[PDB]
RNA sequence: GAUUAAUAGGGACAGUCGGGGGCGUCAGUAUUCAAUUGUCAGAGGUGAAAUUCUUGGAUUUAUUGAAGACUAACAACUGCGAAAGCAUUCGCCAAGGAUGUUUUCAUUAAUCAGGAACGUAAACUAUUAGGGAUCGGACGGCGUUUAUUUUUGACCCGUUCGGCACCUUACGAUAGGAGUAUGGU
């Protein structure tokens, strides 16, 4: 039913990662890595969190994604997620920290 | 140098400066935080902790002991077990206005079981 | 103590981790864990039964208790450390100025 | 009345120690990420030093240690160290106005299948409602095993408190987002200063 | 094909398993104070006229 | 005999109940091995080793404790 | 081009085969400060010299 | 006159194993209440407040006493129980699991109609083929530490049964909504 509820859980990674929390470290940062101290910082964030509302409402493809690599790079920059995301995972199981369950 | 022991019980709500003897039993000096601050909003404060401190600092000094051991506490029963700002501000102002710290202990009610 | 004043010590014992080992976890079985508890109050009632208060303290404080009991339980499983964490005095039946003042 | 100014300039008679204990899988982070603590430490004036060993953190303050509540700091350091906290957030606790704070939940949920659905509707899907938390109350929640470890200001650690016991007791975190959500709304304009804001939430 | 790829990978899993439990037991018993059998000696079993 | 050790260890089990008289596992297990009585005694009466005739509930019990 | 890694090649050998200097070895490790148990042996080393 | 002794049973014995159960007992803090002192102006809550307690002294400081509750940290990709569930020590009482045995009756068994015992919540979801861990036995041993030297235990390694769970592979499988109009009531 709500709306403005519903955008600010799902924006959340993307304002985090921005800018808003200083206090956590990333958001710490990124408050003053360079591509948040720029001049339209702001307005790019905005253009990212539009793209996730029609997304949310709706449309199957993105904007801001690059459609076409040299299989090289795709395949380099996939490992290399999937393996930052798999040792995030392994030094979470390790420690006991809980994590989001996500496939 | 004369040691007396200074209770630092910081809540979040309110600061507790409190000056005693080695022994425990006859306070020497205390002030609380909430009687330097008009608000109560703003009672437990860093602002507030500086002051308490500054004036328990003078009332020691003009009994010249000069030296503190600092046991600082919180809400511990079922509390939060962590000291508010006025535990790092009274050691602050505490310790910038003469008084020679010696010992420091985090002396937390640490319920074995409690609810 | 013989001088009758009853106290309570409270022991507290951690588990050697044993070097030139590969596995993380080094627990002692409940069996093991009941084995060294019985050692350990046995040490206790042995060496403190026996001497009176100002001894005692003379062995509390460069920890005799606790070596001991760390040279004792090591057949049965070794122990990292071995201290004791209270001693708490519940009745002194005497008032008696002799002993208070040959203590100081 | 709240900011509170860096300590400009012996003000420490018996040189004070603090010890914590670590486990190997810890050994190996603290051993690559130490440089970095004994350098802030040593901008602070304590000495910082670990022992894989034993498996030991200890600070110590020095001769040249002016800050009195750096000790504390530093203790509060190596406690989060120890709980495995990451490297730059630990150390970011030595700044002025941060502190920790562990929420014991484990003794909240007599079940165990009950405990372990509510601590991962804490946790939420995709992080989101975790990080949501984050943000409306500036603090960095780590839901750690049975504990819930919370830094930043006074008022978060208050508020993420309240928020981590009512998740707990099977009160919904998007419903406690939706009150702190119109909570921020109501205190951003200062014309609803003083009301009982309960005839909204 | 990919049956014989997992089966080859299995098997080299297998394999190294076993150098694994052979080197420890080399190392931690009474057959550390021998020569290492060569791997084309220990093809044959018995070989009897 | 296999019904003897059966019979012995439902005495055993009656009469830690009876002192106790509050818990509530000795009492599924008696029940389970009163169960595995009444099976194994049923085989050995389509055998005919002992008295069709021959029961036990809690009498027998007393009389062969008895 | 096909010289020798002589780094490799060590180490394919050794995969395949498996009071002067002692000071300022202290005072490079009493900078980290982690303790690191061949600094123990060191410092009891240094003890003996 | 009486088979294989089953890679299905039930029992016996031995060393054990378990935060399984009952009864008693022993502690530990913390909370509340009360008392004794030092008090000497607020304390408590909150985003702010307010109700309330406060010179007969609140909150605080120290020391005792009582009551009721619960068993922090250890505490786990674990243990036990059929399930709900089960974490202080010690004693008693039966029971149970697995292993080992140079242990016995030899189909006793499998499945459930009927029946019988135990009892504020929800809310993001014949093998696989081995390997790495894990704990409970039993066996073996180059060795470090107990050990003043034999036991014995801790650590490392291998074999073997048994069991909670992980990953890979499958051996395979398979199970009306949203808008826009139009006319009635």
Request: proline residues 3%; contains cysteine.
């Amino acid at each position: 039913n709500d709306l403005a509820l519903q955008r600010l859980i799902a924006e959340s990674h993307i304002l985090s990662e921005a800018g808003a929390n200083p206090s956590h470290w990333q958001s710490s940062h990124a408050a003053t890595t360079g591509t948040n101290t720029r001049a339209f910082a702001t307005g790019r964030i905005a253009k990212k969190t539009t793209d996730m509302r029609i997304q949310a409402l709706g449309a199957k493809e993105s904007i801001l994604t690059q459609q076409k690599m040299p299989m090289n790079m795709r395949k380099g920059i996939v490992k290399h997620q999937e393996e930052k995301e798999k040792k995030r995972r392994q030094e979470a199981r390790e420690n006991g920290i809980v994590l989001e369950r996500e496939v | 140098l004369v040691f007396g022991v200074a209770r630092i019980f910081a809540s979040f709500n309110d600061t507790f400066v409190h000056v005693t003897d080695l022994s425990g039993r006859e306070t020497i000096c205390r002030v609380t935080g909430g009687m330097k601050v008009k608000a109560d909003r703003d009672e437990s404060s860093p602002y507030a902790a500086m002051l308490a401190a500054q004036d328990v600092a003078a009332r020691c000094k003009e009994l010249g002991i000069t030296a503190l051991h600092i046991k600082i506490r919180a809400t511990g029963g079922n509390g939060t077990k962590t000291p508010g700002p006025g535990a790092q501000s009274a050691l602050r102002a505490l310790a910038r206005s003469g008084m020679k710290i010696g010992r420091i202990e985090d002396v937390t009610p640490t319920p074995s079981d409690s609810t | 103590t013989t001088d009758h004043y009853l106290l309570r010590l409270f022991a507290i014992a951690f588990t050697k981790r044993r070097p030139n080992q590969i596995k993380k976890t080094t627990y002692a079985q409940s069996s093991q864990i009941r084995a060294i508890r019985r050692k350990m109050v046995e040490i206790i009632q042995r060496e403190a039964a026996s001497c009176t208060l100002h001894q005692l303290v003379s062995k509390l404080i460069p920890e005799v208790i606790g070596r001991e009991i760390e040279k004792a339980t090591q057949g049965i499983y070794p122990l990292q450390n071995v201290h004791i964490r209270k001693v708490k005095l519940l009745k002194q039946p005497k008032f008696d100025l002799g002993a208070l003042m040959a203590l100081h | 009345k709240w900011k509170i100014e860096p300590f400009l300039p012996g003000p420490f008679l018996e040189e004070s120690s603090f010890m914590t204990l670590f486990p190997k899988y810890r050994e190996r982070y603290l051993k690559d990420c130490w440089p970095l603590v004994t350098k802030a430490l040593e901008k602070h004036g304590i000495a910082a030093t670990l022992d894989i060993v034993e498996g030991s953190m200890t600070v110590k303050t020095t001769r040249k240690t002016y800050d009195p509540a750096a000790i504390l700091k530093a203790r509060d350091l190596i406690k989060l160290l120890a709980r495995s906290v990451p490297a730059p957030q630990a150390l970011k606790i030595l700044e002025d106005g941060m502190a920790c704070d562990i929420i014991k939940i484990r003794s909240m949920v007599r079940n165990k299948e009950r405990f372990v659905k509510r601590r991962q509707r804490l946790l939420g899907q995709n992080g989101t409602t975790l990080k949501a938390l984050e943000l409306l109350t500036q603090t960095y929640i780590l839901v750690h095993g049975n504990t819930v470890s919370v830094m930043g200001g006074y008022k978060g650690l208050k508020e993420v408190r309240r928020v981590v016991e009512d998740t707990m007791n099977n009160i919904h975190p998007i419903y406690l987002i939706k009150e702190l959500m119109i909570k921020r709304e109501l205190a951003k304009d200062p014309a609803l200063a003083h009301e009982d804001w309960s005839r909204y939430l | 094909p990919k049956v014989v790829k997992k089966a080859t990978e299995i098997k080299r899993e297998e394999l190294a398993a076993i150098k694994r439990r052979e080197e420890n037991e080399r190392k931690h018993s009474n057959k550390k104070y021998e020569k290492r059998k060569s791997e084309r000696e220990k093809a044959v079993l018995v070989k009897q006229q | 005999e296999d019904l003897y050790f059966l019979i012995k260890k439902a005495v055993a089990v009656r009469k830690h109940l009876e002192r106790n008289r509050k818990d509530k596992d000795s009492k599924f297990r008696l029940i389970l091995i009163e169960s595995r009585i009444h099976r194994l005694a049923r085989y050995y009466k389509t055998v005919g080793v002992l008295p069709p005739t021959w029961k036990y509930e809690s009498s027998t019990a007393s009389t062969l404790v008895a | 081009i096909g010289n020798l890694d002589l780094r490799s090649e060590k180490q394919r050998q050794a995969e395949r085969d498996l009071n002067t200097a002692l000071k300022k070895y202290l005072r490079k490790q009493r900078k980290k400060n982690i303790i690191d148990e061949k600094r123990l042996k060191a410092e009891e080393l240094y003890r003996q010299m």
